[PDB]
Amino acid sequence: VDPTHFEKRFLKRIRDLGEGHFGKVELCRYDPEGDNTGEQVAVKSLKPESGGNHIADLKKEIEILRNLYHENIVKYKGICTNGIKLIMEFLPSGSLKEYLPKNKNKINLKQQLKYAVQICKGMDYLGSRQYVHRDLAARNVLVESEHQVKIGDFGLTKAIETDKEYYTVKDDRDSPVFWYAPECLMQSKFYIASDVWSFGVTLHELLTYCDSDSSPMALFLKMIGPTHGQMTVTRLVNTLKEGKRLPCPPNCPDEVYQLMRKCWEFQPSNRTSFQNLIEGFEALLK
Numbered sequence: 176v177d178p179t180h181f182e183k184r185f186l187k188r189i190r191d192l193g194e195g196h197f198g199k200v201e202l203c204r205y206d207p208e209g210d211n212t213g214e215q216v217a218v219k220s221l222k223p224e225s226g227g228n229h230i231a232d233l234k235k236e237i238e239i240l241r242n243l244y245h246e247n248i249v250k251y252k253g254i255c256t257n258g259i260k261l262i263m264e265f266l267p268s269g270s271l272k273e274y275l276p277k278n279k280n281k282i283n284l285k286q287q288l289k290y291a292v293q294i295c296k297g298m299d300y301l302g303s304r305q306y307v308h309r310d311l312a313a314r315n316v317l318v319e320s321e322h323q324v325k326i327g328d329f330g331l332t333k334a335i336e337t338d339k340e341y342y343t344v345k346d347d348r349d350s351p352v353f354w355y356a357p358e359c360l361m362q363s364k365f366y367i368a369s370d371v372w373s374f375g376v377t378l379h380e381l382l383t384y385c386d387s388d389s390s391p392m393a394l395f396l397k398m399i400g401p402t403h404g405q406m407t408v409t410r411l412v413n414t415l416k417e418g419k420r421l422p423c424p425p426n427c428p429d430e431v432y433q434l435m436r437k438c439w440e441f442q443p444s445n446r447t448s449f450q451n452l453i454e455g456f457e458a459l460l461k
């Protein structure tokens with residue numbers, strides 16, 4: 176018997192956890208004994224509404240996650256099998272976007288920086304395997320406990336080819352543009368340093384406890400224009416070309432803000448690394 180093979184007949188849907196266009200994630204219980212004692216699992220599958228290219232994408236995501244093993248990367252459990260489903264561990268506390276606003280009193284600057292280190296460690300692991308994540312935002316970072324976070328979704332993750340510095344995304348459908356580096360918006364080119372940019376934006380979110388009024392979208396839209404529709408991204412590029420970045424969060428030391436700023440150097444080659452960030456945060460923690 177294969178422990179990563181989940182039979183459809185025992186995989187019982189409890190509720191929806193998240194939904195996009197063409198895909199969804201559900202809370203299921205895997206209950207082979209039929210008495211509600213089975214393990215809860217997060218199940219990602221494709222919607223009938225979805226096109227044909229979306230199945231290939233889900234299969235590639237599965238193969239990526241199947242082979243990643245890290246304390247700060249969400250655990251692959253298996254598959255339920257043309258159509259297919261990805262089975263992952265379920266973390267009840269959900270994402271930082273959901274968890275931080277409800278837990279401010281429990282989570283001080285020290286714990287915020289400890290989470291930041293954990294995000295950087297999972298991301299550095301991903302980078303060592305030549306993947307660019309392309310969706311690094313607080314909503315995709317899961318809370319295991321008050322002491323542990325995990326990178327939690329790999330829907331947009333792509334492999335960077337050997338002897339190559341970036342992946343060019345042909346279809347950039349529903350990209351998180353307010354987390355994206357200039358090269359990503361301008362040329363659809365994704366480097367490891369592009370995830371470092373995104374990490375800086377995620378660090379901002381963490382430091383603001385994912386408050387919606389000071390969210391990356393909100394603050395950038397105030398900077399450029401709430402535009403503007405079709406012109407949003409090109410105006411956003413122009414504001415970034417001018418040198419304008421998200422401001423220092425309230426109660427955020429300049430030292431932490433300077434680490435953030437190094438994520439947002441206009442050129443990818445001049446950005447900080449995840450390892451440099453870890454060392455920076457670790458020196459602030461001691």
Ligand SMILES: Cc1cnc(NC(=O)C2CC2)nc1-c1c[nH]c2c(NC(=O)[C@@H](C)N3CCN(C)CC3)cccc12
Nearest residue numbers: 192193194200217263264265266267268269327328330
């Ligand atoms: C694995 C897991 C374990 N545990 C919890 N825990 C909980 O939900 C707690 C709160 C009850 N969640 C997840 C989880 C992993 N991915 C999720 C997504 N993913 C997306 O929507 C993807 C498709 N998009 C994200 C945005 N991106 C721009 C495009 C892709 C939505 C909702 C949940 C999950």
